[PDB]
């Protein structure tokens, strides 16, 4: 009766950051120990809570968010951060309590001539609210002339593709990111630790 953290971290394919996937983990026993034991982790940043004490806590719900971004952009997955990824693709609340877990995945998400399948939102007229998912592919209107669904002057495609190539530097290589958000409300707990 263990929680399916394997389906989130050992997933064969990851989502793009604009269409980041969320798994609702509830009514299970969360080991949390398969994490903080694997050495294939570039960053493991926990805010407000400690993963060591996670095995002794109960939560009503646990959220796991999966996507792929560049190494330069992993810095922006943190409370009070700004940038293209933080403002238009994935935003954490300034009082975020949880963990952001990222590791290099150049072996899996890089193709010989470039993967070009992982996308990110380049244009947006306002910043995303925390935990918001904008999967719109509508042509971005940068002027006053209607775009009518075509791309051209003052009408750009809102999404940009990553040039994930194995010969890229460490910054440009793809990093799979999992964000663990812990929820607690005035409801009975459903996700407890091993004890």
């Amino acid at each position: 009766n263990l929680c399916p953290f394997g389906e989130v971290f050992n997933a064969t394919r990851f989502a793009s950051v604009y269409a980041w996937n969320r798994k609702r983990i509830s009514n299970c026993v969360a080991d949390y120990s398969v994490l903080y034991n694997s050495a294939s982790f570039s960053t493991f940043k926990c805010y407000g809570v400690s993963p060591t004490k996670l095995n002794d806590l109960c939560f009503t719900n646990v959220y796991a968010d999966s996507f792929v971004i560049r190494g330069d952009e992993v810095r922006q997955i943190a409370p009070g951060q700004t940038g293209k990824i933080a403002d238009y693709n994935y935003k954490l609340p300034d009082d975020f309590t949880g963990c952001v877990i990222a590791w290099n995945s150049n072996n899996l998400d890089s193709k010989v001539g470039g993967n070009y399948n992982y996308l990110y939102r380049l244009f947006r007229k306002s910043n995303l609210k925390p935990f918001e998912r904008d999967i719109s592919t509508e042509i971005y209107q940068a002027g006053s002339t209607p775009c009518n669904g075509v791309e051209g002057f003052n009408c750009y495609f809102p999404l940009q593709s990553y040039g994930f190539q194995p010969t890229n530097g460490v910054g440009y290589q793809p990093y799979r990111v999992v964000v663990l958000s812990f929820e607690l409300l005035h409801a009975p707990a459903t996700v407890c630790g091993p004890k």
């Epitope: 903080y36 034991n37 493991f44 940043k45 407000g48």
Partner: antibody, heavy 119, light 114 residues
């Protein structure tokens, strides 16, 4: 658990440069943040700053802002604390404290480094 | 910069009696969402590095004996030793990890009374 080991005692003249170290070992160290605490002779504990070795995100105290340079080396799991111009007032014991997260209690402490600055 | 003030500065307690240290804050340390106080208590024996005893103002770190107990909420917090022993003579600090910069208490020296 995690254990932190610091460098040896340093005796430097005023105006010299010094870089003390703090190397951490054990499992689940990827999640640990490293912070530096200064304890002047006979005084209490003063928090100087905190750094995360993974991305070197450094958060400095307003009191110690611009006076120190907290760095890290994620390849050898070592955090550093250095001064450009040591002062006689900087003589103290410098502890590095490890916390399994930011806004997490400091579980692991090093043995401390006695820095002595005097003419 | 949250300020933490302790009381008393010096505490004399007979061996086997109860010791109490008060810690006051200039701002509520309680994170209202998770309903926990981001405060900790540390024990530092002379010449030793500080040792963590109680975190979240109520939870006990592994290895700490039962005689140490944490209490308090909001801005007023207390650390209580039930049965003081010869090995408990040290200086105790209360530290907040709710807002950077982290600030420690002034410290309370606990000694055996004779």
């Amino acid at each position: 658990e995690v254990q932190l080991v610091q460098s040896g005692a340093e005796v430097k003249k005023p105006g010299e440069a010094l870089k003390i170290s703090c190397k951490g070992s054990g499992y689940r160290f990827i999640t640990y943040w490293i912070g530096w605490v200064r304890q002047m002779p006979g005084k209490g504990l003063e928090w100087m700053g905190i750094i995360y070795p993974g991305d070197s995100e450094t958060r400095y105290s307003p009191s110690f802002q611009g006076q120190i340079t907290i760095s890290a080396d994620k390849s050898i799991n070592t955090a550093y604390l250095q001064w450009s111009s040591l002062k006689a007032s900087d003589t103290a014991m410098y502890y590095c404290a490890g916390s399994s997260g930011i806004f997490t209690p400091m579980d692991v402490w090093g043995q401390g480094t006695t820095v002595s600055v005097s003419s | 910069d949250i300020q933490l003030t302790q009381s008393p500065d010096s505490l004399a307690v007979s061996l086997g009696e109860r010791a109490t240290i008060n810690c006051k804050s200039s701002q509520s340390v309680l994170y209202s969402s998770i309903n926990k106080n981001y405060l900790a208590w540390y024990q530092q024996k002379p010449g030793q590095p500080p040792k963590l005893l109680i975190y979240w103002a109520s939870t006990r770190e592994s290895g700490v004996p039962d005689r140490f107990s944490g209490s308090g909420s909001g801005t007023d917090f207390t650390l209580t030793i039930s049965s003081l022993q010869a090995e408990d003579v040290a200086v105790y600090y209360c530290q907040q990890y709710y807002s950077t910069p982290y600030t420690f208490g002034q410290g309370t020296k606990v000694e055996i009374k004779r």
